[PDB]
Amino acid sequence: EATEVTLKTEVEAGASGYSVTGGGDQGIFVKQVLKDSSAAKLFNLREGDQLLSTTVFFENIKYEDALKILQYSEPYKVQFKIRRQLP
Amino acid sequence: TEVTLKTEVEAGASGYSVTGGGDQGIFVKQVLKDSSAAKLFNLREGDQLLSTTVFFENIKYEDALKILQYSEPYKVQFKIRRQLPAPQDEEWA
Ligand SMILES: [K+]
Numbered sequence: 001e002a003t004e005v006t007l008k009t010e011v012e013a014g015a016s017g018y019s020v021t022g023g024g025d026q027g028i029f030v031k032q033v034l035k036d037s038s039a040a041k042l043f044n045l046r047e048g049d050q051l052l053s054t055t056v057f058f059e060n061i062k063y064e065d066a067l068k069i070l071q072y073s074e075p076y077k078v079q080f081k082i083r084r085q086l087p
Numbered sequence: 088t089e090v091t092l093k094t095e096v097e098a099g100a101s102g103y104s105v106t107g108g109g110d111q112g113i114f115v116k117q118v119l120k121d122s123s124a125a126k127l128f129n130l131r132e133g134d135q136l137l138s139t140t141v142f143f144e145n146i147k148y149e150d151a152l153k154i155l156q157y158s159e160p161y162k163v164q165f166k167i168r169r170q171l172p173a174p175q176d177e178e179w180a
Binding site: 003004005006007008009010011012013014015016020021022023024025027028043045046048049050051052053054055056057058059060061062063064065066067068069070072073074075076077078079080081082083084085086 | 088089090091092093094095096097098099100101105106107108109110112113115128130131133134135136137138139140141142143144145146147148149150151152153154155157158159160161162163164165166167168169170171172173
């Protein structure tokens with residue numbers, strides 16, 4: 001279980017140029033990362049990293065994309081950050 | 088005037104709908120009385136969903152990948168667990 005670090009990335013946009021593997025009975029792991037990718041340069045994703053979670057910010061997001069994220073995440077553990085008006 | 092909060096971590100959020108997007112944010116539109124949304128997440132009509140965190144625990148690979156693909160254009164933040172080089176720094180004779 002060591003040496004092992006659990007961290008959060010910065011909040012950045014446009015994560016791409018990486019692949020994942022695993023899942024089901026296993027965790028989700030980064031398989032490959034393209035050298036010049038946002039994955040590498042902005043998120044510092046590395047081969048072998050376990051993605052414990054992803055937080056998606058619903059800012060300037062297409063309705064259909066937000067909807068599909070909610071639909072595909074539906075069976076699993078999630079946490080919402082909400083803004084609520086006080087009357 | 089308004090408050091920002093986080094739900095508990097729970098599985099199976101359903102029995103609700105959303106609206107908005109694009110220029111606007113994403114808002115909760117109808118919440119079924121008898122729903123996980125109401126009972127586990129305490130979602131209410133009019134709540135803005137600022138973000139969703141999905142935990143990749145017992146997640147079907149194809150569902151996780153679709154989330155990452157649909158998320159691609161947008162602001163995200165990952166929680167990562169990284170194994171780091173083991174090394175042997177023996178010092179003893
Ligand atoms: K897609």
